[PDB]
Design a protein around this motif. Structure first.
Motif, PDB file in Angstrom:
ATOM      1  N   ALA C 332      47.277  14.786  14.476  1.00 42.66           N
ATOM      2  CA  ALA C 332      48.440  15.586  14.117  1.00 42.66           C
ATOM      3  C   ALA C 332      49.697  14.737  14.240  1.00 42.66           C
TER       4      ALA C 332
ATOM      5  N   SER D   5      41.185  41.680  -1.624  1.00 41.11           N
ATOM      6  CA  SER D   5      39.968  40.987  -1.235  1.00 41.11           C
ATOM      7  C   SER D   5      40.325  39.955  -0.181  1.00 41.11           C
ATOM      8  N   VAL D   6      39.559  39.944   0.905  1.00 42.89           N
ATOM      9  CA  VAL D   6      39.721  38.941   1.952  1.00 42.89           C
ATOM     10  C   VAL D   6      39.335  37.587   1.365  1.00 42.89           C
ATOM     11  N   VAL D   7      40.149  36.570   1.634  1.00 38.96           N
ATOM     12  CA  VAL D   7      39.992  35.281   0.970  1.00 38.96           C
ATOM     13  C   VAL D   7      39.643  34.176   1.959  1.00 38.96           C
ATOM     14  N   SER D   8      40.374  34.074   3.068  1.00 36.34           N
ATOM     15  CA  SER D   8      40.199  32.960   3.988  1.00 36.34           C
ATOM     16  C   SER D   8      40.061  33.459   5.420  1.00 36.34           C
ATOM     17  N   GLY D   9      39.160  32.821   6.168  1.00 36.70           N
ATOM     18  CA  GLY D   9      38.937  33.159   7.561  1.00 36.70           C
ATOM     19  C   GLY D   9      39.102  31.984   8.508  1.00 36.70           C
ATOM     20  N   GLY D  10      39.608  32.245   9.710  1.00 39.95           N
ATOM     21  CA  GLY D  10      39.960  31.178  10.623  1.00 39.95           C
ATOM     22  C   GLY D  10      39.098  31.042  11.857  1.00 39.95           C
ATOM     23  N   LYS D  11      39.539  31.691  12.959  1.00 38.59           N
ATOM     24  CA  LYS D  11      39.064  31.601  14.341  1.00 38.59           C
ATOM     25  C   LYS D  11      37.555  31.436  14.450  1.00 38.59           C
TER      26      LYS D  11
ATOM     27  N   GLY E  88      40.967  26.760  12.193  1.00 35.12           N
ATOM     28  CA  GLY E  88      41.503  27.770  11.318  1.00 35.12           C
ATOM     29  C   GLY E  88      43.016  27.758  11.338  1.00 35.12           C
ATOM     30  N   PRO E  89      43.629  28.722  10.653  1.00 36.74           N
ATOM     31  CA  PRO E  89      45.089  28.857  10.712  1.00 36.74           C
ATOM     32  C   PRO E  89      45.565  29.194  12.119  1.00 36.74           C
ATOM     33  N   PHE E 163      44.724  28.420   1.220  1.00 38.94           N
ATOM     34  CA  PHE E 163      43.788  29.530   1.345  1.00 38.94           C
ATOM     35  C   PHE E 163      42.710  29.517   0.269  1.00 38.94           C
ATOM     36  N   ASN E 166      40.117  27.436   2.445  1.00 36.12           N
ATOM     37  CA  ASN E 166      40.112  27.872   3.846  1.00 36.12           C
ATOM     38  C   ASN E 166      39.933  26.689   4.805  1.00 36.12           C
ATOM     39  N   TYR E 171      48.933  19.043  10.187  1.00 39.21           N
ATOM     40  CA  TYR E 171      49.611  19.544  11.380  1.00 39.21           C
ATOM     41  C   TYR E 171      50.701  18.540  11.728  1.00 39.21           C
ATOM     42  N   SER E 479      42.968  35.287  12.602  1.00 40.41           N
ATOM     43  CA  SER E 479      43.584  34.378  11.640  1.00 40.41           C
ATOM     44  C   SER E 479      42.915  34.477  10.271  1.00 40.41           C
ATOM     45  N   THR E 480      43.190  35.569   9.564  1.00 39.01           N
ATOM     46  CA  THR E 480      42.513  35.914   8.324  1.00 39.01           C
ATOM     47  C   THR E 480      43.543  36.229   7.248  1.00 39.01           C
ATOM     48  N   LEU E 481      43.365  35.613   6.080  1.00 37.40           N
ATOM     49  CA  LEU E 481      44.230  35.793   4.922  1.00 37.40           C
ATOM     50  C   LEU E 481      43.490  36.574   3.844  1.00 37.40           C
ATOM     51  N   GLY E 482      44.107  37.654   3.369  1.00 37.63           N
ATOM     52  CA  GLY E 482      43.598  38.391   2.231  1.00 37.63           C
ATOM     53  C   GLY E 482      44.594  38.404   1.089  1.00 37.63           C
TER      54      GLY E 482
END
Lengths: 493, 317, 475, 233, 486
Positions: C332, D5-11, E88-89, E163, E166, E171, E479-482
């Motif tokens: 980073a 629609s859910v597109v991207s997932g993280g954790k 993730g994000p 996205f 994903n 950073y 941390s989820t993008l829709g």
């Protein structure tokens, strides 16, 4: 995994009149040598082709100096009285020297003991003699007879053209790099006339009135010229036939102006102008002839010259002072068995199939404060910051960065009096600045709240605090007055 | 440069030619694992502090062993390593170890799959040479022995099956300053194996040193004498012995000198006879500084000062 | 050529090539339709592969070798299925197969007819007036395998049943390299070191044509009905002759030509291309032994063509983890300013004995030396009288210069704190009259605002100082 | 007109529900060291290790079985407990994945290709206590479960076997420990170590460490923190 | 000590603590070789390779007190380089979302937890989420339009993301902090790093405008003043690193925040200008210069208000003539040429000082025709050609004390091509407002003439913007993008 971030240097808000790279270049011009001469030197001209040389007029003598050496290379002394002008040809070999007998002596450079042409001007002493630049074999001279004469080398016994129409004391004339036929000429009435050589010539094409006596005519642009006379100097555009700008930025009546373009500089075009006090000032036509730099030599400067764009080396700025001085500022620019057992280090891999490398460059050498702050020995970082030979801004960076990284208390835990002393010595040296008063206040209050009773046990720090109280009261006086002026400044708003 | 050539009798061509930058190539060695048999690493080092490992097709995978997990103070150079097998002997698993020289007696042993500092053994004096001997104990277990040698003539025999311990010592008869020690007769670095059941013991031990002398001993009597007598004392060279290399079946030892040109000698064993009909006076060798054998084919590559690797084949194999 | 010998399969899908591997010949079949790591080393470094035939029901190849026994070798099972031993300590100089019958030339000038379904030598045979024979073929005359051609610099058409030489074609100076019968009653003969292919008509015993190549032939192939004769050429080339059996009318040149080069500039040689009708398969070697292939359409391909392949000539070793310089991908990145410019929010841009004549001269023509030399004065009556007999706009630019020099050396502001008052005192009406006060005097506002900002904190400090110093005065 | 629609997932959805175990890496490397499989909070992402990028994504909403089990829109309990490379049902098929979530489920799916849209579903018996840890030597499986009858949880050890019937998962009821403070399992998977407050009840010191072998009865030792720690502490 | 992992041999111990170091300990001669910097504290360490080739380690990224931002790292043990980083994000919520315990340390800080402090803080966060109504969880999120790149203003950093695939792509650090120069001990975890609050891009996309605040340490003397730092950065499309070109310290004087920052569009100066707005109400329009390569203070409107409130905003008419300014209980209209009120010579009651009911939270004009102004309690939709109100909606029974100032502006955005999109969030309670949430995205067009679409999501929604494919992007507490799109 990441690397270690380098320590970030503290940068203040900008102080007024900050350094531009143009001024960085004008201060990169260093190394001002002074050379004594007999009388007031008159004209300095550099060699066009190889600019490693330049001629300076003197008492009955022309002196060609070098540039990489700045020493006397040639001395022409075959004259009777003081030389008036010295100008090189467009091909860097033949120079002309206007004398005080009414004759321009033109001979080759690099050879003093021969006389190639003795072109007799009018009996009145020839003031300014110059070669052409586009043409290689034509000259133009101006005398006290208030006539200018265009001369060829083939007809050296009679002038090629006799250009007339002047009033009084023609002291400058020059040419335009676009038109090899239209010439400009200035006498002591201002009033730069612009003539044509292919036409008649005795009547100009057009005039441009400069009321105070113009002393130098300078064709800067293919469309613009300079009236360099009187206290001011006016830059005209001849294609519009009117003064594009004017600059009266000078004290005494100006005496010299030259121009340089398309060379190793952040400012492309530079205009030098000397005005008889040692004062040479640099403007730029790109910024509408606005002030960019200025030098002052004590003796009254008579001439000034710059090394040309093809100088290909050390750049030179010479100013001739009327006390007989030359002030030059120069920006300067195992066995066979052993090699046969290690001769492979010079391949560099220009042919092989796969090339791979992961090497890193040797970075900038970290300083003592940087190593101790990265090694977290913070008290000794404070000591090696507070050595005597280290700067106010650098120790400001140390103080700010250490106050940010750690706390002042851990920086100040195990201190004794001999190490307490340089901290407050630097504090008394630097409480009178705007940049660090809050930070020195923080640190001295923290050390006070830590070392209350060692202060009452030690007497040699007591005399330093009484020295602090009398100096901490000037921001209670002078900076308190700084707010009072801030109050009566809004009154005029 | 690391130059990989496919080798024939008529057309010897490039498979790969990699070039490293700021990295001299003084020693380079292939490796195929005893557990995996398909890994094909290349370990390479020069007069620096990093040892490159190139794995085995246009993107090359090059790792670099640069940090030392125990201590980086012993060696200021990686210029000489040797590769070897090592079975854990608690778990029946053989992996790769590399041996590196230090300052005085420190031989560092690294797990090569991760650059791990496994072990280290200190012989005193100045470290001169070392080699790996294999000793099969039973069907499915072998143990490796570090046969290191000093300048004065002491020969140290460590075992590395467990943590590195000294089994024995013995002095070389003669050898005032010793350059190269080399054990042959079985599976070694020059005659590698394909499985654990192919591992055998060596038979002969040659030592080639600055006076041109190669003392040749038999291990079967050296191991029981513990101050052994050389079976042969070859002195057919008068300069520094720089290359001692055995055959893959233990029949010829070649000694080569990087000091003078045309300096290669072949000795038939156990008859211990220096050959006459080769190399002749009209044998192009130059300063012989590198020699290499074929695994099975009976070929010999000789690389010299000029950069040439000439190729011969012995017709019996 | 590292690859020594090579042969295509019928329907052109596979090719077996044999090559030296540490003086041990390995055979290997590579598909050319889209690696095959399977090989067979030769157990002796003495017996070697000499003549190769592809046999189409287990897919197999048939190898006449140095020992004197034909090796039938199944390639799907990757095993030597059979060894047809000939009755002579010699070499199978040529091999030939058509269905079940097999013919071979042994170096004792011996014809041998073998049977695969019998796995047995049917007949040994020898004939006179044939002293060397290094090419053999049987004519496509149906189920009758008789009247076969042999060739070594002079072609002998010789029968099987009648077992005598029938025809004698004038061949070449050097022996015949390739001898291929494309269709009925016409067959072509080409020698090694020859650029001159001889198209011969059988029953007349004559020369139909002569095909010419620009250099020495390496490998020959033909399409079905003589519409294509493709010759790969020893320098590495692919010269194709389209319909060379039609009508200065005897010798015929190449129709089209295809090379293979790389994108760096390096030319890749050609060996053993195979063509079909309106479809061509070209072969080269990518690595030192690895064979690469390509398929290409010769009718659409012009008279001159080259095939480019991007070879790793000077490719930089690209890695996903390591960035373009120094560090890795998960690193980073940090914060760096370099030579970045810093500006606060209070700097507005883009919005009787006097010294009076000297002030006017210096502020008309700026000189810092005159400025400091006249600024060294501190006498308040001189300050008052100068700024009284001073010009208003000259005083404005003087106050600009005063704020500038105060900011440059704050230590100078002591005697200057009493000067800058009188500029606002005497010319204050002109300062109201000017329209841009903050624009002409952003610097004085900046420094007085900065000092006003410091004032409460230093007052707090002074309070703490006074508290502690009275504490250690009283004790 | 508009669809969401859910597109991207993280954790990465690490085992935060346990909070006792120090080996919390759900993600594991395959048999061939080529692909790294991390089960996210909404998907399962497989990355080829050489090219560094996601070689495959497994969206729980795109599947119908993981949506009805992992993506329930009322409860957030069921997260991925452990992945297993080899097939539990058949011995050594190559590109199979066995997923154990929090509540006794076994989802057998296929990577390296297309997910067949009916993954093998197997519910293990005795799912009263929740699944915490699961591991194996050859043949026999071992399951460590967390049971609640002082805010401390008993650990129940069961031995799991298969291949009698399809649904049946045979349990052996190996052992039980009353309460645990800080349990950890070695990297070999044959030894664990735990503590208890039963020693805080019986003696002065608040814990004793007990090391227990799993597939045998060889290392079954107990010793107090009074013998472990010094006196300066 | 956070992590301990033994080797298969039994002589190597991988250790991990709060200082961001994974230490390989060699047990025989008692030595160690480590990795001291890895972007956050190290939670877990484990071995993977059969011959011990890979180290797998899990990290927390402790800079986010609100979110436990996990980071998985694979590691080739040979040269100790970063291979296969997965993350993730990393949003920065305004507070803790759902049962995130700060890890166990010795001294209780704003970044660390003790044991008794862990229990008391767990009870505290549970009782806080039960009793409080202030559940906002608002996240500043931006989209770089020239690459459609998601940008997360992390604490003392930015996270560049896309996205589409994903994966976190960058950073970057932007403040002179100690995030990577030093692993933090407790008494410096009390020295928290500066917070970068605002991250916007100019509509050109090449200029990145940032606002951060620097915190001096505690138990010091200048610990009361906070340093407001605005910054202008630049990057290209082939390069994903921003380079800082201009720094500005203390805009509008010292200790005065610039909490509202609005970029300029392409029509005025090819989007090379910004407008900063305080609680004072003054407007500073900075602009990138032509001859010189920095930005400068081009236009100033400087009043000095004795009262201060963070309930301010500003909007900009697309042709660049007028500026809307949302003051508390007051709407202001500014000319661009002189920075005064909109003096209209016709006097048809389109005045520059409008009165409204409560504290304005956002002012968004959908075009030059319709202006949607949402207060602390009410939303309204007015026209611009005629000064008559058209639409209004009660925002009080859902947003009562839920949000602070500026957060509705950072939440509700407007696509230039389809209309307005607002949000509402409620909680599903079972007999105590239960922690499970439920949100609703509502789409109107043409000053709320009709609801184009009401979509109820079963959980919380923390931020909504629009990607410049005219498709709206919403976030979750996880941390989820829709994407809501056509």
């Amino acid at each position: 995994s990441t690397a270690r971030p380098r320590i970030i240097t503290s940068k203040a808000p900008l102080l007024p009149q900050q350094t531009t790279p143009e001024q960085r270049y004008w201060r990169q011009y260093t190394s001002a040598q002074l050379v004594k001469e007999h009388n007031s030197v008159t004209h300095i001209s550099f060699n066009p082709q190889h600019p490693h040389d330049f001629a300076v007029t003197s008492s009955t003598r022309v002196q060609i100096f070098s540039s990489r050496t700045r020493q006397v290379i040639k001395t022409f002394s075959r004259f009777k009285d003081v030389v008036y002008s010295a100008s090189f040809r467009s091909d860097g070999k033949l120079l002309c020297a206007g004398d005080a007998t009414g004759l321009v002596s033109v001979y080759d450079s690099y050879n003093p003991r021969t006389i190639l042409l003795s072109i007799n001007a009018s009996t009145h002493p020839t003031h300014v003699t110059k070669f052409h630049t586009q043409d290689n074999k034509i000259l133009a001279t101006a005398s006290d007879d208030r006539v200018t004469r265009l001369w060829d080398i083939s007809n050296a016994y009679e002038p090629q053209l006799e250009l007339t129409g002047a009033t009084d004391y023609v002291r400058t004339l020059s040419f335009i790099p676009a038109a090899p036929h239209l010439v400009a000429t200035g006498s002591y009435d201002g009033l730069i006339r612009l003539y044509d050589t292919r036409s008649s010539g005795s009547t100009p094409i057009y005039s441009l009135n400069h009321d105070q006596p113009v002393e130098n005519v300078i064709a800067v642009s293919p469309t613009q010229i300079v009236s360099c006379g009187g206290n001011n100097f006016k830059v005209w555009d001849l294609t519009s036939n009117k003064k594009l700008y004017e600059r009266g930025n000078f004290n005494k009546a100006v005496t010299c102006l030259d121009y340089v373009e398309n060379f190793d500089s952040p400012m492309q075009s530079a205009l030098i102008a000397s005005s008889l006090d040692g004062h040479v000032k640099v403007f730029d036509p790109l910024d509408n002839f606005q002030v960019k730099f200025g030098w002052k030599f004590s003796g009254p400067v008579l001439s000034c010259a710059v090394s040309p764009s093809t100088a290909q080396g050390n750049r030179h700025l010479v100013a001739g002072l009327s006390s007989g001085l030359l002030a030059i500022r120069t920006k300067k620019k195992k066995s066979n068995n052993f090699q046969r057992m290690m001769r492979g280090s010079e391949y560099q891999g220009d042919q092989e199939h796969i090339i791979h490398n992961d090497k890193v460059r040797s970075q900038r050498r970290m300083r003592a404060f940087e190593r101790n702050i990265n090694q977290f020995k913070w008290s000794e970082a404070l000591d090696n910051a507070f050595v005597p030979g280290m700067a106010k801004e650098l120790t400001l960076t140390v103080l700010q960065e250490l106050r940010k990284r750690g706390k002042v208390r851990v920086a100040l835990y195990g201190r004794d009096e001999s190490t307490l002393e340089p901290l407050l010595n630097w504090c008394l040296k630097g409480i009178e600045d705007v940049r660090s008063a809050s930070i020195v206040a923080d640190w001295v209050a923290v050390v006070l709240e830590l070392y209350g009773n060692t202060l009452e046990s030690s007497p040699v720090l007591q005399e330093l605090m009484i020295d602090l109280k009398t100096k901490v009261r000037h921001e209670i006086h002078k900076s308190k007055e700084a707010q009072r002026i801030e109050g009566m400044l809004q009154l005029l708003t | 440069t690391l130059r990989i050539y496919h080798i024939d009798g008529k057309t010897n061509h490039l498979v790969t030619s990699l070039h490293l930058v700021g990295s001299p190539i003084q020693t380079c060695t292939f490796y195929t694992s005893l557990s995996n048999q398909n890994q094909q690493n290349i370990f390479t080092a020069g007069r620096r502090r990093y040892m490159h490992s190139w794995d085995l097709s246009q993107t090359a995978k090059i790792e670099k062993f640069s940090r030392l997990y125990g201590h980086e103070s012993t060696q200021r150079s990686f210029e000489n390593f040797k590769v070897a097998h090592l079975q854990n002997s608690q778990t029946n698993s053989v992996h790769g170890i590399v041996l590196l020289q230090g300052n005085n007696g420190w031989i560092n042993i690294l797990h090569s799959t991760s650059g791990l500092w496994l072990m280290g053994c200190k012989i005193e004096g100045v470290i001169t040479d070392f080699c790996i001997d294999y000793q099969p104990i039973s069907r499915g277990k072998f143990r490796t022995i570090l046969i290191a040698v000093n300048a004065y003539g002491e020969v140290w025999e460590f075992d590395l099956n467990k943590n590195g311990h000294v089994i024995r010592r013995w002095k070389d008869q003669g050898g005032v300053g010793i350059t190269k020690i080399q054990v042959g007769g079985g599976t070694t670095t020059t005659c590698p194996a394909l499985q654990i059941s192919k591992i055998k013991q060596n038979r002969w031990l040659a030592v080639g040193s600055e006076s041109g002398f190669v003392n040749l001993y038999d291990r079967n009597n050296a191991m029981t004498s513990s101050t052994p007598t050389p079976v042969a004392a070859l002195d057919q060279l008068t300069t520094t012995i720089s290359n001692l290399q055995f055959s893959p079946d233990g029949q010829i030892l070649c000694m080569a000198s990087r000091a003078v040109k045309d300096a290669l000698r072949l000795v038939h064993l156990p008859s211990c006879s220096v050959f006459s009909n080769w190399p002749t006076s009209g044998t192009p060798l130059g300063k012989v500084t590198s020699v290499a054998f074929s695994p099975s084919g009976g070929l010999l590559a000789v690389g010299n000062e000029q950069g040439k690797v000439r190729l011969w084949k012995l017709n019996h194999y | 050529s590292p690859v020594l010998q090579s042969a295509y399969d019928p329907s052109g899908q596979y090719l077996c090539y044999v090559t030296v591997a540490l003086d041990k010949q390995r055979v290997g079949v590579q598909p050319t339709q889209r690696w095959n790591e399977n090989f067979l080393y030769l157990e002796d470094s003495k017996l070697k592969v000499t003549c190769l035939k592809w046999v189409n029901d287990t897919v197999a190849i048939i190898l006449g070798m140095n020992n004197g026994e034909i090796w039938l070798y199944s390639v799907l099972a990757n095993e030597v299925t059979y060894k047809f031993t000939t009755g002579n300590s010699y070499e199978i100089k040529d091999i030939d197969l058509m269905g079940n019958q097999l013919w071979c030339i042994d170096s004792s000038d011996a014809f041998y007819q073998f049977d695969l379904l019998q796995f047995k030598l049917l007949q040994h045979f020898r004939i006179n007036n044939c002293v060397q024979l290094n090419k053999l073929t049987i004519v496509p005359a149906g189920d009758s395998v008789a009247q076969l051609l042999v060739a070594s610099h002079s072609i002998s058409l010789i029968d099987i049943e009648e077992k005598k030489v029938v025809m004698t074609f004038p061949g070449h100076v050097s022996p015949v390299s390739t001898l291929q019968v494309i269709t009925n009653e016409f067959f072509i003969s080409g020698a090694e070191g020859d650029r001159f292919l001889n198209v011969y008509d059988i029953h007349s015993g004559m020369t139909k044509c002569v095909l010419v190549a620009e250099s020495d032939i390496k490998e020959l192939s033909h399409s079905g009905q003589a519409d294509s004769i493709a010759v790969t050429t020893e320098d590495g080339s692919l010269e194709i002759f389209v319909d060379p059996l039609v009508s200065g009318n005897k010798s015929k040149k190449s129709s089209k030509k295809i090379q293979i080069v790389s994108k760096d500039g390096r030319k890749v040689p050609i060996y053993n291309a195979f063509i079909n009708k309106d479809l061509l398969n070209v072969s080269w070697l990518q690595n030192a032994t690895m064979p690469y292939f390509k398929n290409l359409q010769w009718r659409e391909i012009p008279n001159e063509y080259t095939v480019e392949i991007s070879l790793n000539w000077n490719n930089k070793n690209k890695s996903a983890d390591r960035d373009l310089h120094g560090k890795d991908l998960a690193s980073a990145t940090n914060y760096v300013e370099g030579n970045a410019r810093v500006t606060s929010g209070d700097n507005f841009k883009h919005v009787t004995g006097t010294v009076t004549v000297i002030l006017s001269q210096a502020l008309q023509s700026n000189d810092h030396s005159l400025l400091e030399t006249v600024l060294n004065n501190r006498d308040e009556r001189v300050i008052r009288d100068t700024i009284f007999r001073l010009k208003p706009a000259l005083a404005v630019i003087l106050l600009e210069r005063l704020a500038e020099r105060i900011a440059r050396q704050t230590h100078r502001q002591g005697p200057l704190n009493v000067w800058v008052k009188w500029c606002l005192i005497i010319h204050g009406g002109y300062l109201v009259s000017i329209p841009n006060l903050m624009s002409t005097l952003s610097s004085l506002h900046s420094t007085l605002k900065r000092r006003s900002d410091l004032l409460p904190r230093l007052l707090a400090l002074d309070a703490r100082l006074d508290c502690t110093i009275n504490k250690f005065k009283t004790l | 007109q508009y669809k969401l629609s859910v597109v991207s997932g993280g954790k990465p959805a690490l085992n935060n529900l346990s909070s006792v175990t120090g080996n919390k890496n759900i993600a594991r490397l395959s048999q061939d060291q080529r692909n790294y499989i991390i089960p996210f909070n909404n998907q399962i992402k497989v990355y080829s290790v050489e090219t560094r990028q996601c070689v495959k994504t497994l969206k729980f909403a795109n599947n119908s079985l993981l949506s009805g089990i992992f993506l329930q829109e009322e409860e957030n309990n069921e997260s991925i407990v452990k992945i297993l490379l080899g097939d539990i049902t058949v011995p050594q098929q190559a590109h199979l994945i066995t997923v154990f979530t929090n509540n006794g489920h076994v989802i057998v799916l296929n990577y390296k290709g297309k997910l067949v849209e009916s993954p093998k579903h197997f519910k293990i018996s005795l799912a009263d206590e929740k699944l915490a840890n699961v591991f194996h030597s050859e043949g026999n499986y071992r399951i460590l479960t967390t049971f609640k009858d002082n805010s401390l949880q008993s650990y129940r050890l069961y031995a799991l076997t298969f291949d009698d019937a399809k649904k049946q998962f045979e349990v052996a009821h190996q052992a039980e420990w009353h309460n645990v403070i800080l349990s950890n399992i070695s990297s070999n998977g044959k030894l664990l170590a735990h503590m208890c407050k039963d020693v805080s009840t019986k003696d002065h010191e608040h814990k004793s460490i007990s090391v227990v072998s799993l597939f045998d009865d060889s290392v079954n030792l107990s010793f107090p923190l009074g013998s472990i720690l010094s006196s300066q502490t | 000590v956070l992590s301990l992992s033994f080797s298969h041999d039994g002589s190597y111990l991988l250790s991990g603590g709060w200082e961001k170091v994974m230490s390989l300990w060699q047990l025989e001669t008692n030595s160690q070789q480590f990795l001291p910097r890895l972007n956050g504290i190290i939670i877990d360490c484990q071995v993977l390779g059969p011959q011990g080739n890979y180290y797998s380690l899990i990290l927390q990224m402790t800079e986010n007190n609100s979110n436990s931002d996990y980071q998985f790292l694979l590691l080739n043990a040979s040269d100790l380089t970063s291979k296969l980083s997965i993350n993730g994000p990393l949003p920065v919520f305004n507070s803790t979302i759902k049962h995130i315990q700060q890890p166990i340390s010795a001294m209780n800080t704003k970044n660390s937890n003790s044991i008794t402090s862990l229990n008391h803080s767990k009870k505290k966060q549970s009782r806080k989420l039960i009793k409080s109504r202030r559940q906002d969880f608002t996240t500043n999120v931006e989209i770089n339009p020239i690459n459609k790149n998601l940008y997360f203003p992390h604490i003392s950093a930015v996270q560049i993301f896309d996205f589409y695939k994903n994966e976190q792509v960058n950073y970057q650090y932007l403040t002179s902090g100690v995030n990577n120069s030093m692993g933090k001990v407790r008494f410096e975890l009390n020295l928290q790093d500066p917070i970068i609050t605002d991250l916007k891009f100019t509509k050109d996309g090449q200029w990145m405008i940032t606002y951060e605040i620097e915190y001096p340490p505690n138990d010091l003397l200048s610990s009361k003043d906070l340093t407001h730092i605005l910054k202008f950065w630049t990057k290209n499309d082939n390069e994903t690193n921003w380079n800082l070109k201009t720094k500005v310290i203390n805009p509008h004087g010292i200790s005065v925040p610039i909490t509202k920052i609005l970029p300029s569009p392409r029509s005025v100066n090819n989007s090379q200008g910004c407008l900063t707005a305080d609680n004072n109400g003054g407007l500073k329009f900075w602009s990138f210069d032509s001859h010189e390569s920095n930005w400068c203070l081009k236009k100033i409107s400087l009043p000095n208000f004795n009262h201060f409130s963070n309930s301010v905003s500003l909007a900009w008419s697309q042709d660049g003539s007028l500026i809307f300014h949302g003051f508390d209980d007051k709407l202001q209209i500014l000319d661009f040429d002189t920075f005064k009120k909109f003096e209209s010579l016709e006097n048809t009651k389109t005045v520059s000082e409008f009165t409204l009911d409560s504290e304005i939270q956002t002012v968004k004009l959908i075009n030059d025709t319709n202006l949607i102004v949402a207060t602390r309690t009410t939303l309204n939709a007015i026209n611009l050609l005629r000064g008559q109100v058209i639409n209004s909606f009660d925002l009080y029974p859902f947003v009562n004390g839920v949000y602070k100032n500026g957060h509705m502006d950072r939440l509700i955005t407007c696509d230039e091509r389809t209309g307005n999109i607002a949000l509402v969030i409620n909680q599903q309670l079972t007999d105590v407002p239960t922690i499970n949430y439920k949100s609703r995205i509502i789409i109107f067009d043409s000053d709320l003439s009709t609801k184009l679409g009401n979509f109820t999501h079963h959980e919380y929604i923390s931020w909504i913007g629009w990607n410049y494919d005219t498709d709206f992007i919403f976030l979750d507490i996880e941390s989820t993008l829709g994407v809501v799109g056509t």
